[PDB]
């Protein structure tokens, strides 16, 4: 819809910011793929709880390395190009 399902099978290697987040939920590897990048960051955001309890679409990280990362302090679940951006900054494509 707003992404093509093909996104999930890009390959990348994370910069230290980022891997720094991932080393706290998945195991650790060189290459990841995007459906695992994903994946692990979604489980960051649930785990440290850092959605709103009463509206859930919105996740708040001003308070959290998550909000470095992404370079906002908060942003919502619904925006999926823009999430794709953000993580974006924060890795490299490998082919
Ligand atoms: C605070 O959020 C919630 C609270 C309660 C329930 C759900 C959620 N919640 N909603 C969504 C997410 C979550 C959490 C974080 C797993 C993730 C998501 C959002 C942000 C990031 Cl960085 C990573 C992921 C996986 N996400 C999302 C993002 C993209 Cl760019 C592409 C597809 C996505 O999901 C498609 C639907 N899926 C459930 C199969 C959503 O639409
Ligand atoms: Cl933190």
Same mark, same amino acid.
């Given at each position: 819809?707003?992404?093509?399902?093909?996104?999930?099978?890009?390959?990348?290697?994370?910069?230290?910011?980022?891997? !720094?987040? %991932?080393?706290?939920?998945?195991? $650790?590897?060189?290459? #990841?793929?995007?459906?695992?990048? *994903?994946?692990? &960051?979604?489980?960051?955001?649930?785990? !440290?709880? %850092?959605?709103?309890?009463?509206? $859930?679409?919105?996740? #708040?990280?001003?308070?959290?390395? *998550?909000?470095? &990362?992404?370079?906002?302090?908060?942003?919502?679940?619904?925006?999926?190009?823009?999430?794709?951006?953000?993580? #974006?900054?924060?890795?490299?494509?490998?082919?």
């Amino acid at each position: 819809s707003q992404i093509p399902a093909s996104e999930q099978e890009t390959l990348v290697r994370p910069k230290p910011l980022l891997l !720094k987040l %991932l080393k706290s939920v998945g195991a $650790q590897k060189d290459t #990841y793929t995007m459906k695992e990048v *994903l994946f692990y &960051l979604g489980q960051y955001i649930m785990t !440290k709880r %850092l959605y709103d309890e009463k509206q $859930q679409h919105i996740v #708040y990280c001003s308070n959290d390395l *998550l909000g470095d &990362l992404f370079g906002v302090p908060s942003f919502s679940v619904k925006e999926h190009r823009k999430i794709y951006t953000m993580i #974006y900054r924060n890795l490299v494509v490998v082919n």
